[PDB]
Amino acid sequence: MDETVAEFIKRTILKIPMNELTTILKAWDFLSENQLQTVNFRQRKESVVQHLIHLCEEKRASISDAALLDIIYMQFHQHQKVWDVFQMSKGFDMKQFKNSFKKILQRALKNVTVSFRETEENAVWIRIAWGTQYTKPNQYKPTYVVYYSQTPYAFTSSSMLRRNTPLLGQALTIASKHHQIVKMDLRSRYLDSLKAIVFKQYNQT
Amino acid sequence: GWLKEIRKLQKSTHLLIRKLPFSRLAREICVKFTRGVDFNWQAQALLALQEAAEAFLVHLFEDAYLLTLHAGRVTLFPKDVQLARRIRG
Amino acid sequence: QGWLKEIRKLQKSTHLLIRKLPFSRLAREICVKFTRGVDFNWQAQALLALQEAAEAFLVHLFEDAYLLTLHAGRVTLFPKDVQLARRIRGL
Amino acid sequence: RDNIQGITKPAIRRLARRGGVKRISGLIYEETRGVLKVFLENVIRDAVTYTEHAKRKTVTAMDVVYALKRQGRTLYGFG
Amino acid sequence: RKESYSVYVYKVLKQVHPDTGISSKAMGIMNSFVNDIFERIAGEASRLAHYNKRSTITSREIQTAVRLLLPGELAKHAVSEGTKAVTKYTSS
Amino acid sequence: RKESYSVYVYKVLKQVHPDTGISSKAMGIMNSFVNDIFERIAGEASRLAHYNKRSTITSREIQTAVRLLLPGELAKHAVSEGTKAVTKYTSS
Amino acid sequence: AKSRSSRAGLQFPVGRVHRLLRKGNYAERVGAGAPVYLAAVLEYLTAEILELAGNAARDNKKTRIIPRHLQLAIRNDEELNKLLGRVTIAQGGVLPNIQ
Amino acid sequence: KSRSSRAGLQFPVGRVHRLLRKGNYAERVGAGAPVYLAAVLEYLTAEILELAGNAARDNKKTRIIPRHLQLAIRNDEELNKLLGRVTIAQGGVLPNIQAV
DNA sequence: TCAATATCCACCTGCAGATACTACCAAAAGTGTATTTGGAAACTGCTCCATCAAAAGGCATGTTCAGCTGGATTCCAGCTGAACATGCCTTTTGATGGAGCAGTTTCCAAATACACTTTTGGTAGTATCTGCAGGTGGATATTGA
DNA sequence: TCAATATCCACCTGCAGATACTACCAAAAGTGTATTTGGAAACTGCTCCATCAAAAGGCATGTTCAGCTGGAATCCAGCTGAACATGCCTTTTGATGGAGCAGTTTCCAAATACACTTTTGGTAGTATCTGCAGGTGGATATTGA
């Protein structure tokens, strides 16, 4: 594979504690369980990741697979990031939402990378890597979004890279069955705490 | 006059290349060796690199203008920069 | 001609070009000015090492310096060429 | 823009003047840029090795100083 | 009392050029070659461990020193060879 | 946690030029100067002891390294100063 | 019983390299895999040079290597010359070069 | 009772000893090596500072800056030889123009 | 263009120095095994200092001109190379002693460890004070005449 | 040479950003006292190789001449610098992260010591064989014709 995705996957895997590497790998499912059994998880981390990277090289891994891995990693390590809330008002199936969001971003910006993954409670996790009309995207400064289709609420992570927030909000508002969006008075590092109060307000207005 | 500008620029010590262009170039070069990763750069590292580069270029220009005069000229040619690098090693 | 035959012959070879006794004599004369006036002995391989190094130095300097005659549009080697080569090298 | 055309004619003229140069040919502005690019590539390659060895994502001044010292160039004012 | 690398140079030579000998003056040059590169690599490896406050020299220090010293494709192949050697040393 | 030679540079300065100060950028240059010469001298002294199969670095190694590194009259005066220092250190 | 050069698959000595690293005041401790790596590197470089030199010898119609051949090899190669640019080979001569 | 005082020095003898011990220069270090080396370092330091202060005086200033160090070094035949592969930050160049 | 003379190039012969091979050996150096220990990896976490945007004004960009310089040509006298005849200095060879190198003693100097005192680095909060920027007045060289 | 204009120096005032000076502290580190150990100096002896002589001839030295080249003087056209008007990119500032750096734990890999093989360096002695020099012998360009 390209030398730029090998480094991405290696750096991503070196961040994962040995106490839970196997669970993440199993969820990713890119490597078969037989290949996992082939590996030794007791020698130092560098050799383990060398072996896993060789396995990925035998197959053909694309930036989509690595993006899926990064999404899965953040599902477990939510607290690493600060999470902000957005609200949508004045208002499609999941596939239409996916296509509209992706096409909006691809029209505004020539070079991007988008990915989705489903989750319980009708949730969808989104990862966006921002680019420009001249330059490639940055895979190490992404933007993560958690949107619950049966609700007008959307939660966002604080990137060290602005200049794309209004476009993101517009894409969320258009791809879904809404036409406006605002920011709520809630922000913290604990996504579940925001979630609980937000749906408490949603169910009990 | 060239004579006033030479005298003024030899009394001075400040850097002559602007910062942001040099920073952009040095970050563009770095990303090729890091395999796509955008490394961070301390502020005191870019100044070091700039000082070194400007010194290198000034001394090279001196050595080359030594070779323009050897040939009976007043005007600096690339012909003269190439040969100085060969002789220096 | 005669210069081209000699150049071709000499670049094809490896042997030393300065005679040995004169080089030995000069090196010993230089050593005696250090040492506080006493005459040191010399191994033979030492003098050969020094001679190889010296001839290499001189041949390479002549190479670097005949590039400055042609720069100046000449064919004849002058001393200013050697001086400037030494200056630019940093010696 | 190509990020090396940001090294302008006046800057190169200033470096030349500080070097004592009276006149300059119009073909000196592209030659200098290549020289500078080569120098920077050589230094930065070694600087990045020193910091990736240490398992960092941040280039410090000591890495640059070590690289230059390797290349035969010793710089004092930094630490 | 005196020791050298001539045995191993002769083996390598008979391994790449089986029909070809080597004179005594040349093997001195090769022995000098081997002693020089050793010193350079070990010197760089000494500093990297000092810069980073380490008391042990490992294969990683040697690898980094190889990358710093050797130019281009030559470093690439040297790294490959050393990595294979360590790999099959450990697996025995 | 960080250490330097600034105190002693300031003393020496007040000892040669009592009316004269020094800026912070310049003392960095002087600290870099002191660290460089130390490394050179100690590096040469390390080799002389290795060449001659010695396990100890003494004042003789430093003296020889000084002669090798420093040019001309500067080495002469440095040797004089070091010899006096050792002489009056021993006599106490 | 078994050596370490054989485990590694090498001709160069892994014990001697270990000894020289320990006796050279390079650091307090020395790992197990450093001598293996270094011996492999040295073997690779030796083989490269000897290959080029044997080729040069054959071109000149000789069966034995001499310093002339090593010099030709080194100066005809764009990388070995950069590694060995401050080095003079005894009894090696110069490359033929007019103009 | 300090070692620098016994020797007549301002530079630190104990620190030099510690740095020689920790630098992997040899398995042992004697007692006169630190004093000898500290004295040499002090001599060179003062030799540079004198010329730098003189250059500052010529420029009508009471504070030393890297320009003065550069002038001192490059106008002295021996210090330039010692420090000829060195570039000094914020030092500039010596004025030099020449007729054709 | 012709071609003898160098000159080149190839090819064969002989032999002398230097290579490669075999045997002995012995020592010193590397390997295996078991024990203990300490350095470094793995995981947390917190504060610093790096990165990203924005607003504007100062330096760079573009066009024209004319004066200066680079480059080619001609001519002539100085100076280098080539050839030839001498002979003086280098090269090769061999008896000789001075200095390097190994082995044995011992003794002086360095490492190890514990207690105790001193010094240096960093922060808080000052207080100067040196040097730079702007303003103004006096004095000369060079531009063109 | 006259001369105005920059330009050159010099002096002055103002101020603010940076250097010296105190306090203080407390952590790290250096010093002093005993004790043990081993590295290097001092002495003797031995044999290797480096200095010092004397013949032989091959390369260096000196003179002269012919021709090649360096250097100076013309001349012409290309091209670089200077000046002016304009606008775009760099500099400065403020706001957040995210990555470096310090802390704790533990476990795995390194040092240490002892007993046992093995490998490499050196020495006779053997022989053999590669390449250098010589000479034959075929065949090409070359500067004088």
Swiss-Prot record, chain A:
Which cellular component terms (GO) are annotated to the entry?
A: cytosol; inner kinetochore; nucleoplasm; nucleus
Localization per Swiss-Prot or TrEMBL: Nucleus; Chromosome, Centromere, Kinetochore
Q: A GO BP term, please?
A: chromosome segregation
Result of mutating residue 11 to A?
Answer: Decreases the binding to centromeres
Please indicate if the UniProt record lists Nucleus as a keyword: yes
| Keywords noted in UniProt | Centromere, Chromosome, Kinetochore, Nucleus, Phosphoprotein
Say which family it is in. Belongs to the CENP-N/CHL4 family.
Q: Which function does this protein serve? A: Component of the CENPA-NAC (nucleosome-associated) complex, a complex that plays a central role in assembly of kinetochore proteins, mitotic progression and chromosome segregation. The CENPA-NAC complex recruits the CENPA-CAD (nucleosome distal) complex and may be involved in incorporation of newly synthesized CENPA into centromeres. CENPN is the first protein to bind specifically to CENPA nucleosomes and the direct binding of CENPA nucleosomes by CENPN is required for centromere assembly. Required for chromosome congression and efficiently align the chromosomes on a metaphase plate.
For this entry, the protein name equals Centromere protein N
State the encoding gene: CENPN
Give the fragment's position in the full-length protein: 1 to 212 of 339
Swiss-Prot record, chain C:
Q: Which GO terms describe its cellular component?
A: CENP-A containing nucleosome; chromosome, centromeric region; condensed chromosome, centromeric region; cytosol; nucleoplasm; nucleosome; nucleus; pericentric heterochromatin
The UniProt GO MF terms for this protein read: chromatin binding; DNA binding; protein heterodimerization activity; structural constituent of chromatin
Cell division as a keyword of this entry, yes or no, is: yes
Provide the primary localization: nucleus
Tell me which residues bear Phosphoserine: 24
Q: Does the keyword Phosphoprotein apply?
A: yes
Region annotation (Important for flexibility of DNA ends that protrude from nucleosomes) ranges: 1-10
Q: Positions of the region CATD?
A: 31-72
The entry sums up its family as follows: Belongs to the histone H3 family.
What does the record give as the function of this protein? Histone H3-like nucleosomal protein that is specifically found in centromeric nucleosomes. Replaces conventional H3 in the nucleosome core of centromeric chromatin that serves as an assembly site for the inner kinetochore. The presence of CENPA subtly modifies the nucleosome structure and the way DNA is wrapped around the nucleosome and gives rise to protruding DNA ends that are less well-ordered and rigid compared to nucleosomes containing histone H3. May serve as an epigenetic mark that propagates centromere identity through replication and cell division.
Q: How does the record comment on the protein's domains? A: The CATD (CENPA targeting domain) region is responsible for the more compact structure of nucleosomes containing CENPA. It is necessary and sufficient to mediate the localization into centromeres.
**Could you tell me the superkingdom of the organism this chain comes from?**
Eukaryota
Effect on the protein of changing residue 24 to A: No effect on interaction with HJURP. Impairs localization at centromeres
Where does it reside? Nucleus; Chromosome, Centromere
Name the species this protein comes from: Homo sapiens (Human)
Q: Which residues of the full protein are shown?
A: 45 to 135 of 140
From Swiss-Prot, chains E, F:
Modified residue N6,N6-dimethyllysine is at which positions?
25
For the modification PolyADP-ribosyl glutamic acid, which residues carry it?
Answer: 3
Keywords of the record, alphabetical order, are: Acetylation, ADP-ribosylation, Antibiotic, Antimicrobial, Chromosome, DNA-binding, Glycoprotein, Hydroxylation, Isopeptide bond, Methylation, Nucleosome core, Nucleus, Phosphoprotein, Ubl conjugation
> Where N6-methylated lysine occurs, residue numbers?
84
N6-crotonyllysine found at: 2
Q: Recall the GO molecular function terms of this protein's record.
A: DNA binding; identical protein binding; protein heterodimerization activity; structural constituent of chromatin
* Keyword Nucleus in record: yes
Range of residues in the leader sequence: none
Name the protein family.
Belongs to the histone H2B family.
Q: Please identify the protein, giving its name as recorded.
A: Histone H2B type 1-C/E/F/G/I
Q: Which organism is it from?
A: Homo sapiens
Give the encoding gene's name.
H2BC4
- Where the shown chain sits in the full protein? 34 to 125 of 126
Swiss-Prot record, chain H:
**Is Ubl conjugation included in the keywords of this UniProt record?**
yes
Record PTM text: It is involved in the initiation of both imprinted and random X inactivation. Ubiquitinated H2A is enriched in inactive X chromosome chromatin. Ubiquitination of H2A functions downstream of methylation of 'Lys-27' of histone H3 (H3K27me). H2AK119Ub by RNF2/RING2 can also be induced by ultraviolet and may be involved in DNA repair. Glutamine methylation at Gln-90 (H2AQ104me) by FBL is specifically dedicated to polymerase I. It is present at 35S ribosomal DNA locus and impairs binding of the FACT complex.
Q: Which UniProt keywords apply?
A: Acetylation, Chromosome, Citrullination, DNA-binding, Hydroxylation, Isopeptide bond, Methylation, Nucleosome core, Nucleus, Phosphoprotein, Ubl conjugation
Q: Which GO terms describe its molecular function?
A: DNA binding; protein heterodimerization activity; structural constituent of chromatin
List N6-(2-hydroxyisobutyryl)lysine occurrences by residue. 22, 60-61, 81
Q: Which residues carry this modification: N6-crotonyllysine?
A: 22
- Judging by the UniProt lineage, the source's domain of life is Eukaryota
N6-(beta-hydroxybutyryl)lysine sites (modified residues): 22, 81
Q: Where in the cell is it found?
A: Nucleus; Chromosome
Cellular component, GO annotation: extracellular exosome; nucleoplasm; nucleosome; nucleus
Sequence positions bearing N6-glutaryllysine: 81
Which residue ranges does UniProt annotate as crossing the membrane? Answer: none
Q: Which GO terms describe its biological process?
A: heterochromatin formation; negative regulation of cell population proliferation
Is Protein transport one of the keywords? no
Residues bearing N6-succinyllysine are 81
Q: Which residues carry this modification: N5-methylglutamine?
A: 90
Q: Where is this cross-link: Glycyl lysine isopeptide (Lys-Gly) (interchain with G-Cter in ubiquitin)?
A: 1
Q: How does it assemble?
A: The nucleosome is a histone octamer containing two molecules each of H2A, H2B, H3 and H4 assembled in one H3-H4 heterotetramer and two H2A-H2B heterodimers. The octamer wraps approximately 147 bp of DNA.
The family classification in the record reads: Belongs to the histone H2A family.
Record protein name field: Histone H2A type 1-C
